Amino acid sequence: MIGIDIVSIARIEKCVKRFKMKFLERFLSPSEIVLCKDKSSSIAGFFALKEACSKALQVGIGKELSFLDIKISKSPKNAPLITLSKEKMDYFNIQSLSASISHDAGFAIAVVVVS
Amino acid sequence: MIGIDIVSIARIEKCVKRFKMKFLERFLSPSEIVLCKDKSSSIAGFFALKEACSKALQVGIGKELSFLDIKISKSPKNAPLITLSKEKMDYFNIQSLSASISHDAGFAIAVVVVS
Amino acid sequence: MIGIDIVSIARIEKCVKRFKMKFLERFLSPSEIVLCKDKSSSIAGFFALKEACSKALQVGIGKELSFLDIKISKSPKNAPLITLSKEKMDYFNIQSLSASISHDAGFAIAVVVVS
What we know:
Three copies of one chain form a homotrimer. In chain A, the strands form two sheets. In chain A, strands 1-5-4 form a three-stranded antiparallel sheet. The first copy, chain A, has helices at residues 9-15, 21-27, 30-36, 40-56, 86-91; strands at 2-8, 70-74, 80-84, 97-104, 107-114. In chain A, a hairpin with a 5-residue loop joins strand 2 (70-74) and strand 3 (80-84). Chain A is 38% helix and 29% strand. Chain A has one domain: CATH 3.90.470.20. By secondary structure, chain A is α+β, with helices and mostly antiparallel strands. It is classed as transferase. Keywords: Gram-negative bacteria, phosphopantetheinyl transferase, transferase. The assembly is trimeric.
């Protein structure tokens, strides 16, 4: 199955002025915060990727899937990797998740394919 | 196979002032019109999803595939579902269609994966 | 696996004024140059598709995959087709590549699914 998401980077930027940490720490774990390096476009991107993951599993971000249930990490070549909780991985019955991100000109977008 | 489409919401809005119904009823069935609730961003989205479906099957919207051959519906959790005519489903030899939509900041985009 | 890319058409346009040919001929082969017909939006699109292909294979455009290792061609119905070098196709161990492009309102985007 597939999920996709497009986010205004500027809209993320203005939500990063909502008690700063209060926003970020809702959807990014500390290690994911390290990955984005304070960069609004990278933050927009992880946000878009988590949304896209929730759409790909057809639940959205609710009480079946939290932002923090979705772990994003990077390959040695900076490729985005995505994993769910080992439990959630079984509850949704997932073999593999494939992800990608891009940004240009005020927009971030992400897409996820789930098996 | 995969198809994708990005549409200006504003461009859809200005085509929704082209005898209103004359535009909408070309690509949306009544039930799909109920789903979009007059919202230009949802209409842009279904349009983008139908285009994306036609690209995923590699024919585009012509005389092998009409807009109205593509039925969009929603899951109970508001996930976009896509089906073709039971005939067209065989003519194109499709096992399953997987879809997703998103919009932000003046743009709608959609993607479809066909098996 | 999946890759996606979004490119500002305008940014491509302004790089098409960087000794014109010096830019284009780095990522487009002559036949691919014929396909885009001088159109900045089509050039943006092939660029986005090549980026998306490199992300889908998880290497990016470096010294494991050049822009010119990725050949884009068109079906009789104008569907984008993508092939790698017969060697690279084995080195990355690829069964099939599926691609799609779209542009509207200053943006091109592309997505690739690799088997």
